[PDB]
Enzyme design. Structure first.
Site, short mmCIF file in Angstrom:
data_model
loop_
_atom_site.label_atom_id
_atom_site.label_comp_id
_atom_site.label_asym_id
_atom_site.label_seq_id
_atom_site.Cartn_x
_atom_site.Cartn_y
_atom_site.Cartn_z
N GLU A 270 -104.69 56.06 -68.35
CA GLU A 270 -104.01 55.63 -69.55
C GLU A 270 -102.99 56.71 -69.84
OE1 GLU A 270 -104.19 52.84 -71.61
OE2 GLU A 270 -102.36 53.97 -72.12
N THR B 117 -101.32 64.32 -61.66
CA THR B 117 -99.95 64.72 -61.97
C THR B 117 -99.68 66.22 -61.89
OG1 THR B 117 -98.27 64.77 -63.75
CG2 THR B 117 -100.56 64.79 -64.41
N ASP B 118 -98.42 66.56 -61.64
CA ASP B 118 -98.01 67.95 -61.56
C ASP B 118 -98.02 68.59 -62.95
OD1 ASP B 118 -95.88 66.53 -62.58
OD2 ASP B 118 -94.36 67.78 -61.62
N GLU B 119 -98.13 67.77 -63.99
CA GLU B 119 -98.15 68.29 -65.36
C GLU B 119 -99.33 69.22 -65.66
OE1 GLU B 119 -97.19 65.39 -68.65
OE2 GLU B 119 -96.41 64.15 -67.03
N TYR C 194 -102.16 64.19 -72.90
CA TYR C 194 -102.22 63.44 -71.65
C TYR C 194 -102.47 64.35 -70.46
CZ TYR C 194 -100.82 60.90 -67.46
OH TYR C 194 -100.82 60.29 -66.23
N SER C 195 -101.63 65.37 -70.29
CA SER C 195 -101.83 66.24 -69.16
C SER C 195 -103.20 66.93 -69.25
CB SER C 195 -100.69 67.27 -69.04
OG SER C 195 -100.61 68.09 -70.18
N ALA C 196 -103.64 67.24 -70.47
CA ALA C 196 -104.95 67.87 -70.63
C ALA C 196 -106.05 66.92 -70.15
CB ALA C 196 -105.19 68.27 -72.10
N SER C 197 -105.94 65.63 -70.47
CA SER C 197 -106.95 64.68 -70.01
C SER C 197 -106.93 64.58 -68.47
CB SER C 197 -106.73 63.32 -70.65
OG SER C 197 -105.51 62.73 -70.23
N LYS C 198 -105.75 64.59 -67.85
CA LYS C 198 -105.69 64.52 -66.38
C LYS C 198 -106.24 65.80 -65.75
CE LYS C 198 -104.28 61.87 -64.04
NZ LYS C 198 -105.08 60.90 -63.29
N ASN D 157 -92.46 59.86 -60.60
CA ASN D 157 -92.16 58.76 -59.71
C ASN D 157 -91.09 57.86 -60.31
OD1 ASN D 157 -94.96 57.83 -57.62
ND2 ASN D 157 -94.54 59.87 -58.51
N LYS E 98 -89.15 52.70 -69.26
CA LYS E 98 -89.20 54.02 -68.64
C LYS E 98 -87.78 54.61 -68.53
CE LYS E 98 -93.59 53.62 -68.21
NZ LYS E 98 -94.44 54.29 -69.23
N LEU E 99 -87.69 55.93 -68.47
CA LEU E 99 -86.42 56.61 -68.41
C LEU E 99 -85.36 56.03 -67.48
CD1 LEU E 99 -84.36 58.77 -68.83
CD2 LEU E 99 -85.88 60.44 -67.81
N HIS F 122 -90.95 70.90 -75.44
CA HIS F 122 -91.30 70.12 -74.26
C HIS F 122 -91.13 71.01 -73.06
CE1 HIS F 122 -87.16 70.47 -74.71
NE2 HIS F 122 -86.75 69.23 -74.48
N1 LIG Z 1 -95.71 57.44 -63.36
C1 LIG Z 1 -95.66 58.71 -62.93
O1 LIG Z 1 -94.61 59.40 -62.85
C2 LIG Z 1 -96.93 59.47 -62.50
C3 LIG Z 1 -96.52 60.87 -62.09
C4 LIG Z 1 -97.76 61.71 -61.65
C5 LIG Z 1 -99.04 61.30 -61.60
N2 LIG Z 1 -99.26 59.92 -62.00
C6 LIG Z 1 -100.61 59.31 -61.91
O2 LIG Z 1 -100.56 58.18 -61.11
C7 LIG Z 1 -101.59 57.24 -61.53
C8 LIG Z 1 -100.96 55.89 -61.78
O3 LIG Z 1 -99.76 56.11 -62.56
P1 LIG Z 1 -98.93 54.88 -63.11
O4 LIG Z 1 -97.68 55.34 -63.74
O5 LIG Z 1 -98.62 53.96 -61.96
O6 LIG Z 1 -99.84 54.13 -64.20
P2 LIG Z 1 -99.66 52.81 -65.00
O7 LIG Z 1 -99.57 53.11 -66.45
O8 LIG Z 1 -98.40 52.11 -64.58
O9 LIG Z 1 -100.88 51.86 -64.65
C9 LIG Z 1 -102.25 52.19 -64.98
C10 LIG Z 1 -103.08 51.04 -64.44
O10 LIG Z 1 -104.53 51.28 -64.66
C11 LIG Z 1 -105.10 50.22 -65.34
N3 LIG Z 1 -106.10 50.78 -66.23
C12 LIG Z 1 -105.96 51.51 -67.39
N4 LIG Z 1 -107.14 51.86 -67.95
C13 LIG Z 1 -108.08 51.33 -67.08
C14 LIG Z 1 -109.48 51.34 -67.10
N5 LIG Z 1 -110.18 51.94 -68.09
N6 LIG Z 1 -110.14 50.71 -66.07
C15 LIG Z 1 -109.41 50.10 -65.07
N7 LIG Z 1 -108.10 50.02 -64.97
C16 LIG Z 1 -107.47 50.66 -66.02
C17 LIG Z 1 -103.95 49.53 -66.06
O11 LIG Z 1 -104.28 48.15 -66.32
C18 LIG Z 1 -102.76 49.69 -65.08
O12 LIG Z 1 -102.60 48.66 -64.06
C19 LIG Z 1 -102.24 57.88 -62.75
O13 LIG Z 1 -103.56 58.39 -62.56
C20 LIG Z 1 -101.19 58.91 -63.18
O14 LIG Z 1 -101.82 60.01 -63.85
C21 LIG Z 1 -98.30 58.98 -62.47
#
Ligand SMILES: NC(=O)c1ccc[n+]([C@@H]2O[C@H](COP(=O)([O-])OP(=O)(O)OC[C@H]3O[C@@H](n4cnc5c(N)ncnc54)[C@H](O)[C@@H]3O)[C@@H](O)[C@H]2O)c1
Ligand SMILES: NC(=O)c1ccc[n+]([C@@H]2O[C@H](COP(=O)([O-])OP(=O)(O)OC[C@H]3O[C@@H](n4cnc5c(N)ncnc54)[C@H](O)[C@@H]3O)[C@@H](O)[C@H]2O)c1
Lengths: 352, 352
Positions: free
Chosen positions: B83, B133-135, B167-171, B197, B206-207, B300
């Protein structure tokens, strides 16, 4: 100054509370849900003070915690409540995840709303002091991995986090939450990480107390594996003094490692206790004779040792005890406190 | 190999699923609870494959997740469910805490039981791959602070954790749980941390997508501060390839940083998109004319940059795209997928 303390009926918590009431001008409101780990008897010679208040609550209960904050208008918070038993709930939560992580999050949110609704003065003096463990740092090189006279590394405030057990992982997480709230919301937080505590009111099943008591009951004094394990032992009364120093003089956004300025192998701890018990309380045979070697526990951290230079340099704190003087006091305490020990063993302590 | 994937209907997750089905021999069972972030349309040209299976479930639901593992007997796990929206709860833990932390814990426990009950062979080949994440690394020195040609630091697998947002703390916490389970129970885990990404199927708000859409709509292209912020942009399809590479060839207990081998200021990102939109979909006036300056978010992180050397050296992975070639493909994708965009904007995508 009014200090809101969580986990006050705990091992370390009780030492903190007793210290503030016996040696300071401050007042305290103690929030504790009294799990198997809490003991109101450990606060018995302090619970009648008008400067002490007890609130039987769970830090996860936001409504209740919010009420308490509003009612006591704390000048600072010292967060010690934590679950150190790693369980496996059927339905859902494992208590350690709930209490250590969710609980810290819950507490942080209550404290944030409270803090931001304060007036400029009281708001700039407020402090949220989080108590943590040196375990978050992972493991250090062991003496027998580094060959002859090479100065071994120590845990410092900038050592990288590397949790190796579910418990330490849960504490590392609460640490992260506390720092992020500071950087994201400006909350006044401080974090301290300390080594192994020992001393009075430590539960009977803990390492040092267990050795002391088994010794006395004529039972096996275990040394695990090679008695290899190295730990930095910090006397509880010393930790207590450092914590109060930090909350009152600590700088927001800072981290402080706290330790007893020593390093000891388990085997050395068991022997030291036997030697003291032979000096004090002699008997027909040496307590050493009950020493027995037993099981080793898989992939366990081999060495924890803390560099407490920073807190010394910046706040001027140093332990008053040495392992030697501290262990002696501990043994004396157990010898003089059978009643307390027996109430814990019988469960009687959980009747308030 | 049967790969169980969480968050498969998300931005990155969907890219991983599409990649496995289109370019590999592996099969996949996708577990996603479909929050506002999930989009089954992003999986539309792959959802009919007999090598693909969808399970509508929440990772916190242990009973359901347990059933699923037992039924599909996965050879590996790729955990991407998370999330990213930081909400608050009038009833206990916020979603990000529940999903990112508790959910990872829950997943880890089901996978542990499953793994320990396998069979020497399949048990030694099993892998639990955690996406992060790199965060978690905190922040890096900005160009304008480290005067002249010094050379700046990069995020490596041994950089100290220092989360600065909830968020980064949770990850960072989910990362610690993953490693502790390995060291404590011997679970085959792997961790990867990647940078920002971008690419196809990225939600409209998104940005990068927002700049592309606002630009064509003729709207203003607002910049926050001086557009100072530096980030390492990784093309999603590249990330997807690295991830599959890691889950199949990665070594248990290892960590791999993944990045697009670049560094860019936001201002550069906006300008780059305008330049491309001027080339393709040319307009008498230039798309920069649309650029404007607003205010910017407080404290930030100023610079994220990843050193992806280890994964290159050890697994031989490198991005196929450059920021330039990748941004071009992204612009072309949005121009060619108005339908997908509109279904997200209207909400229609949440009807399966
Ligand atoms: N977007 C980025 O730039 C980015 C960069 C670094 C790391 N990450 C990591 O990559 C992973 C995916 O990123 P993203 O941007 O594609 O995410 P996202 O927000 O696009 O999608 C999250 C997905 O997980 C599902 N989900 C959420 N809570 C859930 C739960 N409790 N049980 C089951 N499914 C659940 C959602 O329905 C959704 O399809 C994450 O773990 C994120 O930390 C993302
Ligand atoms: N014992 C050590 O050597 C040691 C070493 C380093 C760091 N620490 C830290 O010091 C702090 C206190 O340690 P301790 O050994 O005295 O713990 P403890 O087990 O003796 O006591 C914990 C206390 O918190 C209470 N508690 C538990 N869950 C609660 C909840 N959900 N809400 C409210 N109260 C709750 C218990 O009832 C108990 O009084 C912890 O945060 C711990 O991580 C302990």
């Amino acid at each position: 100054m009014k200090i809101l303390i969580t986990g006050g009926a705990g091992f370390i918590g009780s030492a903190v509370v007793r210290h503030i009431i016996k040696n300071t001008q401050d007042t305290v409101v103690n929030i504790d849900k009294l799990t198997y780990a809490g003991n109101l008897e450990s606060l018995s010679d302090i619970s009648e003070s008008n400067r002490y208040n007890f609130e039987h609550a769970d830090i996860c209960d936001s409504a209740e915690i919010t009420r308490i904050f509003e009612q006591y208008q704390p000048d600072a918070v010292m967060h010690l409540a934590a679950e150190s038993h790693v369980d496996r709930s059927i339905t859902g939560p494992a208590a350690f995840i709930e209490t250590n992580i969710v609980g810290t999050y819950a507490l942080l949110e209550v404290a944030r709303k409270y803090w931001s609704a304060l007036g400029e003065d009281k708001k700039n003096n407020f402090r949220f002091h989080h108590i943590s463990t040196d375990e978050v740092y992972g493991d250090l090189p062991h003496p027998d991995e580094v060959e002859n006279s090479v100065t071994l590394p120590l845990f410092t405030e900038t050592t990288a986090y590397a949790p190796s057990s579910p418990y330490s992982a849960s504490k590392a997480s609460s640490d992260h939450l506390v720092r992020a709230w500071r950087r994201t919301y400006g909350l006044p937080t401080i974090v301290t990480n300390c080594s192994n505590n020992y001393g009075p009111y430590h539960f009977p099943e803990k390492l040092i107390p267990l050795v002391i008591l088994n010794a006395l009951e004529g039972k096996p004094l275990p040394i695990y594996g090679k008695g290899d394990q190295i730990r930095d032992w910090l006397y509880v009364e010393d930790h207590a003094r450092a914590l109060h120093m930090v909350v009152t003089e600590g700088k927001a956004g800072e981290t402080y490692n706290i330790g007893g300025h020593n390093e000891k192998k388990n085997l050395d701890v068991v022997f030291t206790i036997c030697d003291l018990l032979d000096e004090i309380v002699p008997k027909a045979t040496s307590y050493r004779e009950q020493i027995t070697y037993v099981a080793d526990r898989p992939g366990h951290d081999r060495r924890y040792a803390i560099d407490a230079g920073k807190i010394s340099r910046e706040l001027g704190w140093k332990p008053l005890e040495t392992f030697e003087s501290g262990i002696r006091k501990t043994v004396e305490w157990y010898l003089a406190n059978t009643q307390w020990v027996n109430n814990v063993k019988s469960g009687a302590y959980q009747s308030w």
